[PDB]
Every structure is written in C-alpha cells, then in structure tokens.
Amino acid sequence: GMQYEWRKAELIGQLLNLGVTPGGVLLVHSSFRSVRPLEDGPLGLIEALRAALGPGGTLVMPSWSGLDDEPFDPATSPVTPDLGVVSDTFWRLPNVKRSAHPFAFAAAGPQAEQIISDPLPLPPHSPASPVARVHELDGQVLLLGVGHDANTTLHLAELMAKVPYGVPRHCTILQLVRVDYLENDHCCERFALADRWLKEKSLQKEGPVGHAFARLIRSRDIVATALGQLGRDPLIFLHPPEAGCEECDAARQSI
Ligand SMILES: [Cl-]
Ligand SMILES: [Zn+2]
C-alpha cells in the first residue's frame, strides 16, 4: 500500500553497499516489478546503475527477442517481455550498443564494443557470446529481483563443461532463412542450486536494491563453481524423471 518510493541516490548507495565495483563490468538481470516503486521509474534504476559504475564502468543487460521466426534488428526489435521493462528500456537509450543477432545483449560504457562485437553464437551463450565476454573481463553479475534461473552465465558454464544434453532450437537471420542449432535449454529451475553453492562459499553478496532482494556474484565465481558441480554430475541441472518435468526430460532424451 504505502510503500516507499526509492530515490536515485539511495539506489546508488544500496548498489555500492551490495558490492558493485565502480569502473567494472556489470551484467544485470532484473525484474522491475520487484524493485518498484522508485522515483523516476526504470530509467531511474538505469541511471542509478550507471552512476554506481561511474564513467569507467560498463553496464550490460540481456536484450534478446525470443521470436524464432522473426529476424532481429538492434534498432527496433524489442526485448522479450520475460526479461523485464528495464532490459527493454536500456537498449533504446543513447550510446548503448546492441548485438546484431536474435540472442542479443545491450551494453553501455567503455567496454560495450568488446562485449557486443561478436556475431550470432550457437548455442546462444557460447564462449563467443556476450555472457562470455563479461566473464573474460572479470565482470560482476547482478541478480535484481530474480533468482538463479535467470542467471544466464550458468548456461555458459554448461557449454564450457561440454554438457551432454542438447535439444534442437532455431532462429531466423536475413541473407527468412531458418538456422537451427542444438541448445542446452530446460526449465532452468534447478539453477537455484547455485544459490546455496555460492552463498555457502561466501561468493554471493546479498542485500536490498529498492524493494528487491538482490544477489551479486563475480562472473568467474559463477562459472568456476558450476564447472565443479557439472564435473561431478553433468546432469546436475536436470530435474529427475520422478519430478516429471517436461522441459527437463526433453534434454535427457537427446543424450
Ligand atoms: Cl518488469
Ligand atoms: Zn526441469
């Protein structure tokens, strides 16, 4: 009811207290519904993120469409509604770059060109994808009002582990020429296991940003931790057949 509208300067303080590194690279998965209400809305949250990073920092967000039948255009193609209003708002602002493939990210800062430059990666989160360019630049991953099921960097860890499962997906690029690949996609619910893995090793910082429960982990810690669990169980992220997950049993089928 009478919830507090967070000011921009307050959000910067929360982000610094959470542990965001000024001048660093920060990949942010967000749900604005969790952070809301704020004064000045989603742009205010973006301005707070950019201010916490400072002029040397680079802010990165997912920015893909999800439409496998439609070609992607970095100038008009909207972000899928599942990534939130902040992601769909970030890429439209001035001087923020965007990848030129349907699995795009958006980045603004002195490092945006390096994180965005790569062509279409198959699977979408391969070692040649923006999520890997954040990892090689020692970036931070901010989970803003979302769980680890949205931690895209975990998908990169599956690919680096050479994970056995791979279901066929597809997309469209202009040369309507369908491009199918083998992706490691599932319900992603079991990604929440990484929460206990990381927090217990003291690798996950937790705190409030706005009204949201926020989690901040170094991208290298996400990959290194997950690679150890994947090295013990390549199917650690797969629901057992007992749980009867339709999205997970499909990945089990394709070896
Ligand atoms: Cl949202
Ligand atoms: Zn599942």
Author numbering: 0 to 174, 178 to 257
Excerpt from the paper describing this PDB structure:
Here, we conduct a comprehensive functional analysis of the Antibiotic_NAT family of aminoglycoside acetyltransferases. AG resistance is primarily conferred by three classes of aminoglycoside-modifying enzymes (AMEs): phosphotransferases (APHs), nucleotidylyltransferases (ANTs), and acetyltransferases (AACs). AMEs permanently alter the AG substrate, preventing them from binding to their target, the A-site of the 16S rRNA in the bacterial ribosome. The fold typical of the Antibiotic_NAT family is evident in all structures, composed of 13 α-helices and 8 β-strands, and determined structures superpose with pairwise RMSD’s 0.8–1.0 Å between 197 to 266 matching Cα atoms.
Our structural data includes the crystal structure of the AAC(3)-IVa enzyme which is the first molecular image of a Group 1 Antibiotic_NAT enzyme. Our extensive structural and functional characterization demonstrates that this enzyme mediates broad-spectrum AG resistance, including to 4,5-, 4,6-disubstituted AGs and the atypical AG apramycin by evolving a more spacious active site. This is achieved by a C-terminal extension and modifications of the structure and residue composition of the α4-α5 hairpin of the minor subdomain of the enzyme which allows for broad spectrum of AG recognition. Finally, insert 4 is a C-terminal extension to the major subdomain unique to AAC(3)-IVa and forms an α-helix and a C3H1 Zn2+ binding site. We identified a Zn2+ ion binding site in the C-terminal extension of AAC(3)-IVa structure. This feature may be of only structural significance since neither this ion nor the sidechains of its cysteine and histidine ligands formed any interactions with the AGs. The binding of Zn2+ could stabilize this region and allow for orientation of the Glu249 residue for AG recognition. The Zn2+-binding residues are fully conserved across Antibiotic_NAT Group 1 representatives. The buried surface area between subunits of the AAC(3)-IVa dimer (~650 Å2) was formed nearly exclusively through interactions between the major subdomains of the two monomers of this enzyme. Collectively, these observations show that AGs can adopt multiple bound orientations facilitated by the dramatic structural changes in the minor subdomain of AAC(3)-IVa, thereby supporting broad substrate specificity for AG modification.
